[PDB]
Design a protein around this nucleic acid. Sequence first.
RNA 1: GGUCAAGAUAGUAAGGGUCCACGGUGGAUGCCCUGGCGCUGGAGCCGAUGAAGGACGCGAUUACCUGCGAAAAGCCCCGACG
Length: 54
Amino acid sequence: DFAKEIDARKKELMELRFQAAAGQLAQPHRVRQLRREVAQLNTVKAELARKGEQ
RNA sequence: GGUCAAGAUAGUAAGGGUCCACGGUGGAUGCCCUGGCGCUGGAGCCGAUGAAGGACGCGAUUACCUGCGAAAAGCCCCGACG
Ligand SMILES: [Mg+2]
Ligand SMILES: [Mg+2]
Ligand SMILES: [Mg+2]
Ligand SMILES: [Mg+2]
Ligand SMILES: [Mg+2]
Ligand SMILES: [Mg+2]
Ligand SMILES: [Mg+2]
């Protein structure tokens, strides 16, 4: 299921980039906060990959 | 006092010179250290699970440096500080 939440994050992240090329970007923090949720995502996936399979 | 004669003799500065005073220039000098040099003593290999050194790129705004790498001034677990 993890990839679904990853890509849902990626869509709004690109939406923020698109506004940021424009004059609208009132909450820049949401930018970097959206990316760490991606990284944590991927990280935890690797944390399951070794688990169980050994 | 006046005229004539003969004689001697100042001052003037265009610009200059020596000295004094006030600056401009310039960055010597003292002081300092954000940087070096040397000795002693430690520690001493990286790489095909990708080295050394790089090229692009990552930031709301980022030309240079750092750090980092599309999971990108970073992600997770432990411990320390508070
Ligand atoms: Mg005469
Ligand atoms: Mg002087
Ligand atoms: Mg010194
Ligand atoms: Mg290397
Ligand atoms: Mg950008
Ligand atoms: Mg990937
Ligand atoms: Mg502290």
